[PDB]
Amino acid sequence: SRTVITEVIATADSQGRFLNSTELQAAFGRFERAVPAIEAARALTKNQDALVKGAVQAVFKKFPYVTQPGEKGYGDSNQAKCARDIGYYLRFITYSLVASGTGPLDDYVIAGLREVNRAFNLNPLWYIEALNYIKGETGKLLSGQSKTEALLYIDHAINALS
Amino acid sequence: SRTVITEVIATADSQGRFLNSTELQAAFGRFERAVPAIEAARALTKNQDALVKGAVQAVFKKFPYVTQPGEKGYGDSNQAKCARDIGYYLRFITYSLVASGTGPLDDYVIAGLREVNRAFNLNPLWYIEALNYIKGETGKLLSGQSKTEALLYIDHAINALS
Amino acid sequence: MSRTVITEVIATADSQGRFLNSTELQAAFGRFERAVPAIEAARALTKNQDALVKGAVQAVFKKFPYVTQPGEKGYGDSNQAKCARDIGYYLRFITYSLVASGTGPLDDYVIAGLREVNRAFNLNPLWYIEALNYIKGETGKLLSGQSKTEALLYIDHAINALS
Amino acid sequence: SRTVITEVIATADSQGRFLNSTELQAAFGRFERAVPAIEAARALTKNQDALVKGAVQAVFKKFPYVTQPGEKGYGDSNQAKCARDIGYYLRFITYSLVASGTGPLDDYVIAGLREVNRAFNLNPLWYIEALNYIKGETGKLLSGQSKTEALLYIDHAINALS
Amino acid sequence: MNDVFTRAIAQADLKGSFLLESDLDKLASFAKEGVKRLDAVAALTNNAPAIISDAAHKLFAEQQELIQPGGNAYPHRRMAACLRDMEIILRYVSYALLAGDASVLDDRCLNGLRETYNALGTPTQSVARAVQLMKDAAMVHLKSTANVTVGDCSSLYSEAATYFDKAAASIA
Amino acid sequence: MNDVFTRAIAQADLKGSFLLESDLDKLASFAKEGVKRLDAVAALTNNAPAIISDAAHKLFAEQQELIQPGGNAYPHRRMAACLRDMEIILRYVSYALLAGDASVLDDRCLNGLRETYNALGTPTQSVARAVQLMKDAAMVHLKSTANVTVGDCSSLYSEAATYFDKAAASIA
Amino acid sequence: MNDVFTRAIAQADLKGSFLLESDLDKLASFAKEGVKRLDAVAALTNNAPAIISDAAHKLFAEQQELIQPGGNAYPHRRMAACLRDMEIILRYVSYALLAGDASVLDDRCLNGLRETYNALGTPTQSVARAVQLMKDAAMVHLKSTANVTVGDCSSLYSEAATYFDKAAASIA
Amino acid sequence: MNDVFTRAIAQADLKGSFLLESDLDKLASFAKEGVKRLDAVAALTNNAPAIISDAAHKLFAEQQELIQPGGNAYPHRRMAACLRDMEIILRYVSYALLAGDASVLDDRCLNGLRETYNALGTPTQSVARAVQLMKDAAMVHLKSTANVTVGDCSSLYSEAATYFDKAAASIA
Amino acid sequence: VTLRAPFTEEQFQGALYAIYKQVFGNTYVMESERPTTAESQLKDGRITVRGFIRLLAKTEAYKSRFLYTTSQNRFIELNHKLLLGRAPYDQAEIIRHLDLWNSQGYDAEIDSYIESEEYQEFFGEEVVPFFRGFKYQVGQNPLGFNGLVRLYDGYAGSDTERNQSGQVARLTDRLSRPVREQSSVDRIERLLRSYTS
């Protein structure tokens, strides 16, 4: 992937040198911010189910036309698959929080996002809506530093989808 | 020049994308490191007059044969150049310190240094040991984080001379 | 992959995919007819193992007396012994470059990666420069004519690389 | 070790008598054949290097397919090892000649060869044609009873390798 | 190219689950004591010339055939290759130390280096002994407690030792 | 690559010795017959199209099989390839002639050729016979006595025959 | 990379002969049936996204294990790779349908495909299954009587089926 | 000998009480993981000759001073003894793994071998690197899930690690 | 695949497809990775195809696929095969590029390819690189053709990081021996005296 540590190592490797002071200071800043990030990861880990469902019904509520038969929303397997997708994004946001880098998102969701979205006629707007719900919910769930730390990856994913 | 902010803007610009989490938060870490480095710059600024004489005398005593007549160290003009040049190094040390990166130091000393030393027949060991003396002196002038940041910069400089 | 006049001319003709035309025959013939003074100087130096190596180490000690005292590189009997070995290496590669009538052996055997090996064992180039200046002095008298010209030209090339 | 004198001395010790005609007669035979065998071994030492290197080449002329890059026979240290091993084989043959007993072969190489070959996949047939090469040369390089006994010992060496 | 965090995320994706609480706890511990690791990596970085010089000195002392004529480090070019190779090995040792992961070492450097040294007839034992001399000098320079606050680092010492052992074992 | 001077330097160095007086004797000899060697190399350079065309005529005389439809040198795009291969091998033979060793011929030309031709499906015996025919058609231009001083040069014809033989044995 | 015309030309030139009047008749019939061939190629081309999506849906319905963790087609990158592979395969079968000969497949599509999959670990039976689903989806679109005149194209349907079988057999 | 269950019963007799429920809990855990244990021991048995062979390769490459004359492996009977020694020590540590209790290792393997080797002149340190190369070779096959369902055996992996650690510290 | 500067909208995508197929190999490159600013700059000719290929070489996708997961040998071979079209001929190239990278950075290592005279002659500023070692290119070894055959295993295949080989070096063993085994004949008996000691 590409964390802070991993990006520092890549920069000091391609350039074929050692790690100087600035790269070590970047690593130090990462080590500092790790603990708020791990706290946020714990918090979002505990409330996985509530976030996933609340986002699911939020998305169905924003575009009510999706639900009725003859389109994507209808079908029990389809809604279970909606839940699976929203859980996927939530898990990868937690992963980015743990690693303190946008690596896992770029690796697992963003790389290939547009082509898979267009191939299956999926819509980003649904996922921006769900990510907005998770944004709002984590707004009250979290507070302080871990708050903005999680919000940053949430709206990074929203920017990627938008 | 090069700062942490410079690599932020570059590695956000080469990829052709807006600033994501990692580079903003690395800038944040630079911002914590900024002001204590500024007081360290104050400390090394108040003692430049002592340090230039300490470094030139260090050059004189650790190498006796350079000081004898007919060599690089003998000569009033030569020693005035020694003092001026060590003042130049120490001012670049202050510049790099306030910059939170070796950038000004890098592009005023390091980049292609060795052929410059080689053209005039100027040894780098002289400046390695002089900067070692400055290491020892700033070790007692500063303690804790300021001592660490000054020592790392002088170490980067001596590595450049090495 | 030593580089001597025949070798550069064959390389440049191979790169262009052409036979050897008149210009590299010019170089080859001139180089062959120049071989004789080169081999004469090479054998002259070859006889002179001991005089040159010993004079070079003594001249190094004379020019860098502070090295001799303990606590420095020069201290230690086997140390100066294998310093004499280094000087023998340099002389041998000078003779090799004479014989080949090209800087191929000197380059590929000493000059390639010379700064790194000097710095990483902390060897002072001026040591070897002063030794080669002594060798200048010795070949000023031992040789004569074109052979002297070739030997000094090669030794100044080696100095230029070290210095 | 093992050699006619030593089997005699053991079977007189562990049996608990003093020696009589048969064993001392065998000793007579051994002490008289010494000169043929001993000069034969002298000649083997006198011509050994051709034997070993031409044995390597003989193996390859019979086994070129084992030599190509990517299989066992390929390799420089491998080659040095090949010559080394066949050197010991010739060497122990010489010892056998000197001892006038099959002992040294038994004690050193015939003791446990099979399983070390199975461990290292070393085909004995290789060593077999190497020794066939060897006997081809010793037919000419040696004569009379000496070539007879040398051929006998190397034949038993093959029988071990067989 | 992975650190311990990316390894943990890799196992989590292999299972398909969130990171379990034990994993998160040990990762938080890693991050908390990571300021040990940063300082150890810095010690390696600023001492590396000394380790390289010392490994060279003792190595050519034990095996002077490497500097004998025809020895496989005789000309200045193969001396430079020797020193550059030891320097590179130390670089990826420090990279593994900072990352807490032996993935960068093994993949980026140690995947074909045995075959590289075999193809050139280089005695891999000399390279392995050079790596061991580097680990010994690195430990000597890691005991340095100057300019720093004193504490325990036995975890880091074991990590550096096992990284150097990984190098010297993958080579030969 | 290694001509005879750098070759002798190599065997002198790998055994850690200077160049023995006898070695200097042989190599100064080589130098003095250098002008005869230059004449031979010029003979090979200037008569190159004639040697190639004569070898081609003979080779497609015995084996018309190549130039029939379905034969290797048929499609008129493979005939130019045949002629260019002949040019390349002749050029490398003249290179090895001027240098004095087959190092040029065995390095830049021969190490990977038999399997190249196996990959392309080209018969290698025909290429070997082309090189032998080139040796024949090139000795006669090499022995030409016109417009050059007269002297014994059997060493150079022996040597050029060895180089052509070595190229043919490599490809065959 | 040979169409049917160039294939007949090549097996003519092997015989060193002119094209027989029978081969002329065959290629004239092919050129006459080229209108049907073009309509089949167009039906495949226009309905490329529909066919690829339909085959993907059927493949991920009958086989789920690809998309759960540890499966071949998990992340967005691997789903994109799967769809890209299927699109390429359909594209090459359309190419072969126009050419009339399977040369383009073995030359470009399947030249190093099975080796690629056995390298990356992709289940090759799954790729064959996807190709079979594209066969089923594509025959439906080819048989679309709408917007074109009516005529017997069963030969073209069989030919396209054989192309899909060839790709499936090569991949598996 | 005394297996893990035998040790539990023996300590129960030493305290003269019944089993606790927690005792049955650990014992049931061992019973349920016995399947993974059997997979591990099969991994040992299948590759055992291969493992001992390549481990010996790394050992003798690592230590060349023994196969050469004057070494207690030179006379090539000592080949047989040495190979049998690795075979039997891996066999006993496999016994310990299968039983899950290193007691049988202690008794049948390492009661008194130290005096054995010292009175035989064998330098046990060599044997210590021998067994650690044994673990280095074996752990690869242990991680090999070829033809077996994948899963976590980190408990078993660490158990084998401490087994060979016992062997090392023992023979050392 | 040339790009005459007054070119129109169509086949700009064609040139891009050719470039992303050549530089990266047949490895897929998701348009999450396409540098859009570089393509825009190339559109009006602010940079040539040579400058654009320089950029794509110096992106993080090219590094991710080729540098990080591979040793330096495989990296040198891949640079040659992708930005030049030919396998390396001799160990001198590998040594030169390895030391150049080690001393001056990936930036200078790539600039050694892009602004070399071979690139100027064979492709120039405005021709997309292509594999050319299959034909006899002037002044090559027979190992150049063999190497390009070895690296290019199939049209469908590619040089993919995401593989169980680990993207190992295909050719350094092939390329290694010829230059550095003429001294094997003596290293033999040196090893013999080492062993028999």
Ligand SMILES: CCC1=C(C)/C(=C/C2=NC(=C\c3[nH]c(/C=C4\NC(=O)[C@H](C)[C@H]4CC)c(C)c3CCC(=O)O)/C(CCC(=O)O)=C2C)NC1=O
């Ligand atoms: C990185 C992990 C990952 C993701 C994120 C991913 C996206 C993804 N979502 C899919 C299905 C789907 N997902 C949805 C979601 C919609 N349903 C309702 O309409 C809502 C408005 C909305 C939910 C917010 C739907 C309708 C499908 C079915 C698409 C189809 O079959 O045509 C599919 C196709 C089959 C499948 O994989 O299950 C993919 C590839 N794939 C992955 O491997």
Ligand SMILES: CCC1=C(C)/C(=C/C2=NC(=C\c3[nH]c(/C=C4\NC(=O)[C@H](C)[C@H]4CC)c(C)c3CCC(=O)O)/C(CCC(=O)O)=C2C)NC1=O
């Ligand atoms: C902008 C930053 C800057 C730096 C870094 C700098 C170093 C510097 N010192 C120089 C000359 C010199 N530097 C020295 C001092 C050395 N020789 C001995 O006396 C001492 C052992 C030793 C001092 C530690 C001397 C003597 C010269 C005169 C040239 C000579 O004697 O060879 C020169 C050549 C041109 C000149 O300044 O006159 C440079 C560039 N100058 C700068 O303007």
Ligand SMILES: CCC1=C(C)/C(=C/C2=NC(=C\c3[nH]c(/C=C4\NC(=O)[C@H](C)[C@H]4CC)c(C)c3CCC(=O)O)/C(CCC(=O)O)=C2C)NC1=O
């Ligand atoms: C004195 C009694 C004696 C015996 C019996 C003996 C057998 C023997 N063969 C060995 C290697 C070997 N020996 C061979 C066989 C030779 N190489 C092959 O190329 C040829 C076919 C063949 C020669 C014609 C092989 C293939 C190896 C394995 C080399 C390795 O993998 O390291 C080794 C040491 C493992 C090593 O360091 O490579 C021994 C002990 N050594 C002895 O000192």
Ligand SMILES: CCC1=C(C)/C(=C/C2=NC(=C\c3[nH]c(/C=C4\NC(=O)[C@H](C)[C@H]4CC)c(C)c3CCC(=O)O)/C(CCC(=O)O)=C2C)NC1=O
């Ligand atoms: C083929 C060409 C070639 C040469 C010539 C060469 C020289 C050379 N210089 C070395 C370092 C050295 N060189 C010297 C020589 C110095 N001692 C002083 O008395 C003198 C002023 C001066 C020489 C006249 C010394 C003492 C060392 C040891 C430095 C150290 O080990 O820290 C070494 C390492 C040998 C060892 O550690 O014992 C070599 C081989 N290397 C090569 O590959």
Ligand SMILES: CCC1=C(C)/C(=C/C2=NC(=C\c3[nH]c(/C=C4\NC(=O)[C@H](C)[C@H]4CC)c(C)c3CCC(=O)O)/C(CCC(=O)O)=C2C)NC1=O
């Ligand atoms: C960037 C990551 C990387 C590195 C650094 C690497 C090392 C490496 N060392 C090499 C040669 C070499 N390696 C060495 C060093 C060894 N030989 C002696 O035994 C020394 C004692 C010993 C040092 C410990 C030497 C001397 C050469 C030169 C051999 C020759 O030129 O023929 C080569 C082949 C050509 C060259 O670079 O000179 C590589 C690729 N491989 C990689 O993938």
Ligand SMILES: CCC1=C(C)/C(=C/C2=NC(=C\c3[nH]c(/C=C4\NC(=O)[C@H](C)[C@H]4CC)c(C)c3CCC(=O)O)/C(CCC(=O)O)=C2C)NC1=O
């Ligand atoms: C700018 C780059 C950088 C440097 C130079 C650096 C060194 C460094 N190490 C620190 C903590 C520390 N570092 C060490 C380790 C040291 N003491 C032991 O004796 C070891 C021998 C030795 C190095 C391995 C210890 C013991 C502490 C304090 C305990 C702790 O952090 O929990 C601290 C913070 C001091 C504090 O927490 O009050 C710094 C700045 N960190 C960085 O990000």
Ligand SMILES: CCC1=C(C)/C(=C/C2=NC(=C\c3[nH]c(/C=C4\NC(=O)[C@H](C)[C@H]4CC)c(C)c3CCC(=O)O)/C(CCC(=O)O)=C2C)NC1=O
């Ligand atoms: C620098 C050293 C070097 C050599 C010598 C060399 C030979 C060489 N000859 C080739 C083609 C060829 N070579 C031949 C010639 C053979 N066919 C007939 O049997 C003739 C008797 C015989 C000529 C003596 C033919 C017909 C081809 C074309 C093969 C094809 O295109 O299918 C090729 C394949 C590249 C191409 O298509 O042009 C090589 C690499 N390559 C090198 O890099």
Ligand SMILES: CCC1=C(C)/C(=C/C2=NC(=C\c3[nH]c(/C=C4\NC(=O)[C@H](C)[C@H]4CC)c(C)c3CCC(=O)O)/C(CCC(=O)O)=C2C)NC1=O
């Ligand atoms: C620009 C390239 C160049 C060429 C071509 C050249 C030819 C050349 N050949 C010479 C003598 C000679 N040339 C030849 C060669 C011929 N004699 C044999 O019978 C063969 C027919 C044939 C050689 C196979 C010989 C044998 C000598 C006598 C040299 C001696 O006495 O050793 C000489 C010295 C006197 C003279 O004729 O001017 C020259 C300059 N010199 C050059 O600088």
Ligand SMILES: CCC1=C(C)/C(=C/C2=NC(=C\c3[nH]c(/C=C4\NC(=O)[C@H](C)[C@H]4CC)c(C)c3CCC(=O)O)/C(CCC(=O)O)=C2C)NC1=O
């Ligand atoms: C000649 C034209 C051409 C072909 C034919 C081609 C096939 C191809 N597919 C690839 C990746 C892939 N292809 C698939 C497709 C599979 N996914 C499911 O299993 C499906 C059953 C199946 C699709 C039918 C997957 C999952 C990957 C990524 C596998 C990995 O990287 O681990 C790759 C590796 C390139 C990369 O690094 O992304 C190639 C070369 N590439 C080409 O340029």
Ligand SMILES: CCC1=C(C)/C(=C/C2=NC(=C\c3[nH]c(/C=C4\NC(=O)[C@H](C)[C@H]4CC)c(C)c3CCC(=O)O)/C(CCC(=O)O)=C2C)NC1=O
């Ligand atoms: C834009 C480029 C273009 C194309 C590709 C094209 C195809 C094409 N289709 C045609 C009609 C036709 N099209 C078809 C094919 C159909 N028969 C059905 O069974 C199938 C559903 C289907 C094929 C699978 C047939 C059989 C004809 C009658 C022409 C004939 O029999 O030769 C004709 C001749 C007009 C006619 O006779 O009515 C052409 C040229 N025309 C164009 O201008």
Ligand SMILES: CCC1=C(C)/C(=C/C2=NC(=C\c3[nH]c(/C=C4\NC(=O)[C@H](C)[C@H]4CC)c(C)c3CCC(=O)O)/C(CCC(=O)O)=C2C)NC1=O
């Ligand atoms: C003849 C004696 C015997 C053996 C050898 C045996 C192996 C065995 N292991 C099984 C399950 C398993 N086997 C393993 C162990 C393997 N997977 C892990 O990744 C490791 C790499 C490795 C162990 C080192 C695991 C993890 C399971 C899954 C069962 C579970 O959920 O715990 C199964 C049930 C399903 C199947 O047929 O594969 C068998 C039969 N069973 C026996 O009666």
